[PDB]
Design a protein around this ligand. Structure first.
Ligand SMILES: Nc1nc(N)nc(-c2cc3ccccc3cc2Br)n1
Length: 207
């Protein structure tokens, strides 16, 4: 289990989002779903010039899995996934930029709901989660587990759990006053509102 320090800016944006009273929190789901859509595009694009890239899964889709027992909402995709390098880098590199850019955009006006415009929407998850765990498997690399609680650092390890062939799995450990996002009707209501244009199937796994 490796531990890394978030690039300063990133850590800030995180604790900002994590400790800021916002009202349009529901937009976090749109941000995560967006990423998965993009992750799906990539994996697909690579297939157009190489079918083998799909020997790890020919199905391109997104899955929403609420779990009242663990108080966790999980967004799962079968996209490109991330290599340990990309996992560590992507959530410790690009952000130093986007993250700062977006924070500057906040003081300059813009509201939290625009975060996605700065290629760092992912972090909006901390609006409704106290801890976020990321599981990913890239065609080349192995299955890793990224995790952080906006403490300034994050940890990466090899995921022992359930194998997934290919794709990314974002596990949101919801905050106490945010369990409303484990309600089928609510999730469904949100997806219809901000993600009615995703080109990939989105399945909701009720309990
Ligand atoms: N679903 C998904 N697929 C891929 N490839 N990457 C992401 C992803 C991108 C990010 C880009 C910038 C900052 C954080 C990110 C966190 C994740 Br978890 N999410």
């Amino acid at each position: 289990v490796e531990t890394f320090a978030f690039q300063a800016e990133i850590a800030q944006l995180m604790s900002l989002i994590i400790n800021t009273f916002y009202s349009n929190k529901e937009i976090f789901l749109r941000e995560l779903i967006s990423n998965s859509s993009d992750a799906l595009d990539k994996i697909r694009y690579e297939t157009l010039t190489d079918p083998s890239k799909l020997d790890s899964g020919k199905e391109l889709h997104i899955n929403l899995i609420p779990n009242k027992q663990d108080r966790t909402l999980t967004i799962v995709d079968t996209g490109i996934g991330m290599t340990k390098a990309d996992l560590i880098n992507n959530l410790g590199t690009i952000a130093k930029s986007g993250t700062k850019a977006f924070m500057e955009a906040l003081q300059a006006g813009a509201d939290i709901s625009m975060i996605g415009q700065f290629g760092v929407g992912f972090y909006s998850a901390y609006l409704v989660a106290e801890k976020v765990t990321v599981i990913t498997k890239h065609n080349d690399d192995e299955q890793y587990a990224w995790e952080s609680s906006a403490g300034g650092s994050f940890t990466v390890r090899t995921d022992t759990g359930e194998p997934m062939g290919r794709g990314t799995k974002v596990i949101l450990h919801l905050k106490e006053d945010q369990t409303e996002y484990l309600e089928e009707r609510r999730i469904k209501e949100i997806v219809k509102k901000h993600s009615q244009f995703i080109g990939y199937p989105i399945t909701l796994f009720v309990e």
